[PDB]
PDB file of all heavy atoms in Angstrom:
ATOM      1  N   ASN A   1     -81.303-147.523  57.793  1.00  0.00           N
ATOM      2  CA  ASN A   1     -81.292-146.776  56.560  1.00  0.00           C
ATOM      3  C   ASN A   1     -80.059-147.057  55.723  1.00  0.00           C
ATOM      4  O   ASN A   1     -80.125-146.951  54.494  1.00  0.00           O
ATOM      5  CB  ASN A   1     -81.365-145.271  56.841  1.00  0.00           C
ATOM      6  CG  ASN A   1     -82.642-144.870  57.491  1.00  0.00           C
ATOM      7  OD1 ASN A   1     -83.696-144.750  56.831  1.00  0.00           O
ATOM      8  ND2 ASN A   1     -82.656-144.625  58.764  1.00  0.00           N
ATOM      9  N   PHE A   2     -78.901-147.372  56.354  1.00  0.00           N
ATOM     10  CA  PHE A   2     -77.680-147.652  55.608  1.00  0.00           C
ATOM     11  C   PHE A   2     -77.812-148.862  54.703  1.00  0.00           C
ATOM     12  O   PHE A   2     -77.122-148.941  53.692  1.00  0.00           O
ATOM     13  CB  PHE A   2     -76.537-147.933  56.601  1.00  0.00           C
ATOM     14  CG  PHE A   2     -75.946-146.804  57.395  1.00  0.00           C
ATOM     15  CD1 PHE A   2     -76.705-145.700  57.740  1.00  0.00           C
ATOM     16  CD2 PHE A   2     -74.662-146.858  57.867  1.00  0.00           C
ATOM     17  CE1 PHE A   2     -76.155-144.675  58.510  1.00  0.00           C
ATOM     18  CE2 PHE A   2     -74.095-145.817  58.646  1.00  0.00           C
ATOM     19  CZ  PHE A   2     -74.885-144.748  58.944  1.00  0.00           C
ATOM     20  N   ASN A   3     -78.688-149.835  55.069  1.00  0.00           N
ATOM     21  CA  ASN A   3     -78.875-151.025  54.293  1.00  0.00           C
ATOM     22  C   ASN A   3     -79.441-150.849  52.893  1.00  0.00           C
ATOM     23  O   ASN A   3     -79.424-151.735  52.071  1.00  0.00           O
ATOM     24  CB  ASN A   3     -79.692-152.047  55.045  1.00  0.00           C
ATOM     25  CG  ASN A   3     -78.873-152.560  56.204  1.00  0.00           C
ATOM     26  OD1 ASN A   3     -77.690-152.781  56.084  1.00  0.00           O
ATOM     27  ND2 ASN A   3     -79.517-152.714  57.371  1.00  0.00           N
ATOM     28  N   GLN A   4     -79.985-149.628  52.625  1.00  0.00           N
ATOM     29  CA  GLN A   4     -80.506-149.300  51.273  1.00  0.00           C
ATOM     30  C   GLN A   4     -79.412-148.857  50.305  1.00  0.00           C
ATOM     31  O   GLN A   4     -79.664-148.550  49.198  1.00  0.00           O
ATOM     32  CB  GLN A   4     -81.593-148.243  51.406  1.00  0.00           C
ATOM     33  CG  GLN A   4     -82.762-148.665  52.263  1.00  0.00           C
ATOM     34  CD  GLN A   4     -83.481-149.815  51.649  1.00  0.00           C
ATOM     35  OE1 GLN A   4     -83.751-149.822  50.383  1.00  0.00           O
ATOM     36  NE2 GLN A   4     -83.872-150.739  52.463  1.00  0.00           N
ATOM     37  N   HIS A   5     -78.104-148.837  50.734  1.00  0.00           N
ATOM     38  CA  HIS A   5     -77.018-148.403  49.943  1.00  0.00           C
ATOM     39  C   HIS A   5     -75.888-149.416  50.045  1.00  0.00           C
ATOM     40  O   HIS A   5     -75.513-149.772  51.152  1.00  0.00           O
ATOM     41  CB  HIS A   5     -76.545-147.006  50.451  1.00  0.00           C
ATOM     42  CG  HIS A   5     -77.678-146.021  50.368  1.00  0.00           C
ATOM     43  ND1 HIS A   5     -77.983-145.352  49.190  1.00  0.00           N
ATOM     44  CD2 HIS A   5     -78.636-145.698  51.297  1.00  0.00           C
ATOM     45  CE1 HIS A   5     -79.045-144.638  49.462  1.00  0.00           C
ATOM     46  NE2 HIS A   5     -79.500-144.819  50.721  1.00  0.00           N
ATOM     47  N   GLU A   6     -75.323-149.873  48.914  1.00  0.00           N
ATOM     48  CA  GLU A   6     -74.280-150.877  48.876  1.00  0.00           C
ATOM     49  C   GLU A   6     -73.037-150.482  49.641  1.00  0.00           C
ATOM     50  O   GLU A   6     -72.446-151.275  50.352  1.00  0.00           O
ATOM     51  CB  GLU A   6     -73.970-151.291  47.449  1.00  0.00           C
ATOM     52  CG  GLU A   6     -75.028-152.073  46.765  1.00  0.00           C
ATOM     53  CD  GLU A   6     -74.749-152.526  45.330  1.00  0.00           C
ATOM     54  OE1 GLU A   6     -73.701-152.127  44.792  1.00  0.00           O
ATOM     55  OE2 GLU A   6     -75.603-153.255  44.789  1.00  0.00           O
ATOM     56  N   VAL A   7     -72.592-149.203  49.521  1.00  0.00           N
ATOM     57  CA  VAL A   7     -71.395-148.726  50.196  1.00  0.00           C
ATOM     58  C   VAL A   7     -71.583-147.294  50.621  1.00  0.00           C
ATOM     59  O   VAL A   7     -72.173-146.472  49.918  1.00  0.00           O
ATOM     60  CB  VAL A   7     -70.144-148.984  49.348  1.00  0.00           C
ATOM     61  CG1 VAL A   7     -70.228-148.301  47.975  1.00  0.00           C
ATOM     62  CG2 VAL A   7     -68.866-148.514  50.097  1.00  0.00           C
ATOM     63  N   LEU A   8     -71.172-146.956  51.834  1.00  0.00           N
ATOM     64  CA  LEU A   8     -71.344-145.647  52.417  1.00  0.00           C
ATOM     65  C   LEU A   8     -70.104-145.219  53.136  1.00  0.00           C
ATOM     66  O   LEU A   8     -69.466-146.032  53.837  1.00  0.00           O
ATOM     67  CB  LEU A   8     -72.488-145.592  53.436  1.00  0.00           C
ATOM     68  CG  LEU A   8     -73.789-146.272  53.085  1.00  0.00           C
ATOM     69  CD1 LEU A   8     -73.735-147.749  53.533  1.00  0.00           C
ATOM     70  CD2 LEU A   8     -74.953-145.572  53.765  1.00  0.00           C
ATOM     71  N   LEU A   9     -69.820-143.878  53.174  1.00  0.00           N
ATOM     72  CA  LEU A   9     -68.916-143.223  54.059  1.00  0.00           C
ATOM     73  C   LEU A   9     -69.767-142.615  55.131  1.00  0.00           C
ATOM     74  O   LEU A   9     -70.748-141.933  54.811  1.00  0.00           O
ATOM     75  CB  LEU A   9     -68.153-142.100  53.314  1.00  0.00           C
ATOM     76  CG  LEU A   9     -67.367-141.196  54.191  1.00  0.00           C
ATOM     77  CD1 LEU A   9     -66.265-141.934  54.992  1.00  0.00           C
ATOM     78  CD2 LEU A   9     -66.739-140.050  53.385  1.00  0.00           C
ATOM     79  N   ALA A  10     -69.541-142.923  56.421  1.00  0.00           N
ATOM     80  CA  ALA A  10     -70.425-142.471  57.485  1.00  0.00           C
ATOM     81  C   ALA A  10     -69.803-142.144  58.773  1.00  0.00           C
ATOM     82  O   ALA A  10     -68.750-142.701  59.094  1.00  0.00           O
ATOM     83  CB  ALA A  10     -71.457-143.570  57.724  1.00  0.00           C
ATOM     84  N   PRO A  11     -70.439-141.280  59.573  1.00  0.00           N
ATOM     85  CA  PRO A  11     -70.012-141.089  60.956  1.00  0.00           C
ATOM     86  C   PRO A  11     -70.745-142.085  61.828  1.00  0.00           C
ATOM     87  O   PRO A  11     -71.775-142.746  61.413  1.00  0.00           O
ATOM     88  CB  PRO A  11     -70.508-139.662  61.253  1.00  0.00           C
ATOM     89  CG  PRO A  11     -71.857-139.655  60.513  1.00  0.00           C
ATOM     90  CD  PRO A  11     -71.683-140.511  59.294  1.00  0.00           C
ATOM     91  N   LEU A  12     -70.348-142.223  63.136  1.00  0.00           N
ATOM     92  CA  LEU A  12     -71.126-143.002  64.061  1.00  0.00           C
ATOM     93  C   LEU A  12     -72.400-142.235  64.428  1.00  0.00           C
ATOM     94  O   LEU A  12     -72.269-141.087  64.895  1.00  0.00           O
ATOM     95  CB  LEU A  12     -70.310-143.290  65.304  1.00  0.00           C
ATOM     96  CG  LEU A  12     -69.252-144.332  65.129  1.00  0.00           C
ATOM     97  CD1 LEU A  12     -68.327-144.435  66.314  1.00  0.00           C
ATOM     98  CD2 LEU A  12     -69.928-145.674  64.979  1.00  0.00           C
ATOM     99  N   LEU A  13     -73.548-142.846  64.180  1.00  0.00           N
ATOM    100  CA  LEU A  13     -74.811-142.128  64.471  1.00  0.00           C
ATOM    101  C   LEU A  13     -75.054-141.893  65.968  1.00  0.00           C
ATOM    102  O   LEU A  13     -74.599-142.761  66.758  1.00  0.00           O
ATOM    103  CB  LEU A  13     -75.975-142.931  63.904  1.00  0.00           C
ATOM    104  CG  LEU A  13     -75.939-143.144  62.431  1.00  0.00           C
ATOM    105  CD1 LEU A  13     -77.138-143.948  61.947  1.00  0.00           C
ATOM    106  CD2 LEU A  13     -75.982-141.771  61.632  1.00  0.00           C
ATOM    107  N   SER A  14     -75.591-140.778  66.261  1.00  0.00           N
ATOM    108  CA  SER A  14     -75.913-140.329  67.638  1.00  0.00           C
ATOM    109  C   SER A  14     -74.676-140.043  68.495  1.00  0.00           C
ATOM    110  O   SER A  14     -74.812-139.737  69.663  1.00  0.00           O
ATOM    111  CB  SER A  14     -76.852-141.264  68.368  1.00  0.00           C
ATOM    112  OG  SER A  14     -78.072-141.307  67.628  1.00  0.00           O
ATOM    113  N   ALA A  15     -73.465-140.132  67.948  1.00  0.00           N
ATOM    114  CA  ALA A  15     -72.239-139.861  68.676  1.00  0.00           C
ATOM    115  C   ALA A  15     -72.059-138.301  68.644  1.00  0.00           C
ATOM    116  O   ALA A  15     -72.874-137.542  68.127  1.00  0.00           O
ATOM    117  CB  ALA A  15     -71.072-140.648  68.016  1.00  0.00           C
ATOM    118  N   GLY A  16     -70.993-137.833  69.289  1.00  0.00           N
ATOM    119  CA  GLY A  16     -70.667-136.433  69.337  1.00  0.00           C
ATOM    120  C   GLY A  16     -71.722-135.650  70.079  1.00  0.00           C
ATOM    121  O   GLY A  16     -72.226-136.045  71.143  1.00  0.00           O
ATOM    122  N   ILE A  17     -72.161-134.511  69.411  1.00  0.00           N
ATOM    123  CA  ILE A  17     -73.094-133.609  70.017  1.00  0.00           C
ATOM    124  C   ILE A  17     -74.512-134.258  70.148  1.00  0.00           C
ATOM    125  O   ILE A  17     -75.361-133.677  70.873  1.00  0.00           O
ATOM    126  CB  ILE A  17     -73.159-132.254  69.273  1.00  0.00           C
ATOM    127  CG1 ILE A  17     -73.860-132.369  67.916  1.00  0.00           C
ATOM    128  CG2 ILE A  17     -71.766-131.644  69.150  1.00  0.00           C
ATOM    129  CD1 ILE A  17     -74.017-130.990  67.277  1.00  0.00           C
ATOM    130  N   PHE A  18     -74.755-135.427  69.559  1.00  0.00           N
ATOM    131  CA  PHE A  18     -75.998-136.146  69.778  1.00  0.00           C
ATOM    132  C   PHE A  18     -76.104-136.872  71.135  1.00  0.00           C
ATOM    133  O   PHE A  18     -77.162-137.344  71.536  1.00  0.00           O
ATOM    134  CB  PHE A  18     -76.311-137.067  68.575  1.00  0.00           C
ATOM    135  CG  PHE A  18     -76.913-136.391  67.360  1.00  0.00           C
ATOM    136  CD1 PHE A  18     -76.224-135.399  66.696  1.00  0.00           C
ATOM    137  CD2 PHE A  18     -78.196-136.760  66.885  1.00  0.00           C
ATOM    138  CE1 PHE A  18     -76.766-134.758  65.585  1.00  0.00           C
ATOM    139  CE2 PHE A  18     -78.703-136.142  65.768  1.00  0.00           C
ATOM    140  CZ  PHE A  18     -77.986-135.143  65.109  1.00  0.00           C
ATOM    141  N   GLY A  19     -74.986-136.935  71.873  1.00  0.00           N
ATOM    142  CA  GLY A  19     -74.983-137.442  73.218  1.00  0.00           C
ATOM    143  C   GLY A  19     -74.913-138.930  73.533  1.00  0.00           C
ATOM    144  O   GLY A  19     -74.910-139.259  74.736  1.00  0.00           O
ATOM    145  N   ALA A  20     -74.975-139.798  72.522  1.00  0.00           N
ATOM    146  CA  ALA A  20     -74.945-141.231  72.811  1.00  0.00           C
ATOM    147  C   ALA A  20     -73.525-141.724  72.995  1.00  0.00           C
ATOM    148  O   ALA A  20     -72.584-141.060  72.559  1.00  0.00           O
ATOM    149  CB  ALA A  20     -75.684-142.017  71.727  1.00  0.00           C
ATOM    150  N   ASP A  21     -73.380-142.900  73.638  1.00  0.00           N
ATOM    151  CA  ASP A  21     -72.065-143.531  73.815  1.00  0.00           C
ATOM    152  C   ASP A  21     -71.600-144.008  72.442  1.00  0.00           C
ATOM    153  O   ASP A  21     -72.259-144.871  71.876  1.00  0.00           O
ATOM    154  CB  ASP A  21     -72.213-144.673  74.797  1.00  0.00           C
ATOM    155  CG  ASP A  21     -70.905-145.432  75.058  1.00  0.00           C
ATOM    156  OD1 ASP A  21     -69.873-145.130  74.386  1.00  0.00           O
ATOM    157  OD2 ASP A  21     -70.926-146.370  75.939  1.00  0.00           O
ATOM    158  N   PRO A  22     -70.488-143.517  71.939  1.00  0.00           N
ATOM    159  CA  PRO A  22     -69.986-143.968  70.605  1.00  0.00           C
ATOM    160  C   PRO A  22     -69.659-145.446  70.566  1.00  0.00           C
ATOM    161  O   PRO A  22     -69.763-146.080  69.492  1.00  0.00           O
ATOM    162  CB  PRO A  22     -68.775-143.108  70.327  1.00  0.00           C
ATOM    163  CG  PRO A  22     -68.359-142.552  71.698  1.00  0.00           C
ATOM    164  CD  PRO A  22     -69.574-142.463  72.499  1.00  0.00           C
ATOM    165  N   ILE A  23     -69.238-146.057  71.693  1.00  0.00           N
ATOM    166  CA  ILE A  23     -68.948-147.517  71.729  1.00  0.00           C
ATOM    167  C   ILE A  23     -70.272-148.277  71.451  1.00  0.00           C
ATOM    168  O   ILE A  23     -70.312-149.232  70.682  1.00  0.00           O
ATOM    169  CB  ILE A  23     -68.347-147.914  73.105  1.00  0.00           C
ATOM    170  CG1 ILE A  23     -66.976-147.240  73.264  1.00  0.00           C
ATOM    171  CG2 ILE A  23     -68.248-149.441  73.227  1.00  0.00           C
ATOM    172  CD1 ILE A  23     -66.211-147.552  74.513  1.00  0.00           C
ATOM    173  N   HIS A  24     -71.366-147.803  72.067  1.00  0.00           N
ATOM    174  CA  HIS A  24     -72.699-148.372  71.844  1.00  0.00           C
ATOM    175  C   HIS A  24     -73.098-148.124  70.339  1.00  0.00           C
ATOM    176  O   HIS A  24     -73.582-149.078  69.706  1.00  0.00           O
ATOM    177  CB  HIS A  24     -73.722-147.797  72.808  1.00  0.00           C
ATOM    178  CG  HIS A  24     -75.094-148.273  72.512  1.00  0.00           C
ATOM    179  ND1 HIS A  24     -75.413-149.620  72.574  1.00  0.00           N
ATOM    180  CD2 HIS A  24     -76.194-147.611  72.087  1.00  0.00           C
ATOM    181  CE1 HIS A  24     -76.647-149.716  72.191  1.00  0.00           C
ATOM    182  NE2 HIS A  24     -77.207-148.542  71.910  1.00  0.00           N
ATOM    183  N   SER A  25     -72.863-146.967  69.813  1.00  0.00           N
ATOM    184  CA  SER A  25     -73.180-146.663  68.418  1.00  0.00           C
ATOM    185  C   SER A  25     -72.455-147.609  67.436  1.00  0.00           C
ATOM    186  O   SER A  25     -73.072-148.108  66.502  1.00  0.00           O
ATOM    187  CB  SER A  25     -72.879-145.234  68.041  1.00  0.00           C
ATOM    188  OG  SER A  25     -73.373-144.938  66.756  1.00  0.00           O
ATOM    189  N   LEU A  26     -71.182-147.893  67.676  1.00  0.00           N
ATOM    190  CA  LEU A  26     -70.436-148.763  66.824  1.00  0.00           C
ATOM    191  C   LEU A  26     -70.961-150.253  66.909  1.00  0.00           C
ATOM    192  O   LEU A  26     -71.057-150.898  65.879  1.00  0.00           O
ATOM    193  CB  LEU A  26     -68.949-148.753  67.260  1.00  0.00           C
ATOM    194  CG  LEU A  26     -68.053-149.697  66.484  1.00  0.00           C
ATOM    195  CD1 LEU A  26     -68.087-149.484  64.991  1.00  0.00           C
ATOM    196  CD2 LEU A  26     -66.606-149.619  67.063  1.00  0.00           C
ATOM    197  N   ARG A  27     -71.383-150.656  68.099  1.00  0.00           N
ATOM    198  CA  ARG A  27     -71.976-151.943  68.309  1.00  0.00           C
ATOM    199  C   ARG A  27     -73.269-152.101  67.567  1.00  0.00           C
ATOM    200  O   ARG A  27     -73.442-153.041  66.812  1.00  0.00           O
ATOM    201  CB  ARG A  27     -72.190-152.153  69.827  1.00  0.00           C
ATOM    202  CG  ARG A  27     -72.979-153.415  70.238  1.00  0.00           C
ATOM    203  CD  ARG A  27     -72.583-154.762  69.582  1.00  0.00           C
ATOM    204  NE  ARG A  27     -71.146-154.888  69.426  1.00  0.00           N
ATOM    205  CZ  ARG A  27     -70.514-155.747  68.649  1.00  0.00           C
ATOM    206  NH1 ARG A  27     -71.136-156.638  67.914  1.00  0.00           N
ATOM    207  NH2 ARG A  27     -69.181-155.743  68.582  1.00  0.00           N
TER     208      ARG A  27
END
């Protein structure tokens, strides 16, 4: 979804309370 916008301020998706490994999210 991020590819539809030229520039974005964002968090790591599925990180934090969403339970995924943030290292995996960054990758």
Side-chain angles (χ1 to χ4, degrees):
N1 294 284
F2 286 29
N3 290 321
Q4 301 293 319
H5 301 276
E6 291 181 354
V7 57
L8 315 88
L9 169 60
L12 283 171
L13 301 178
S14 299
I17 74 174
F18 279 61
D21 179 355
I23 296 182
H24 176 60
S25 187
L26 177 57
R27 173 43 41 196

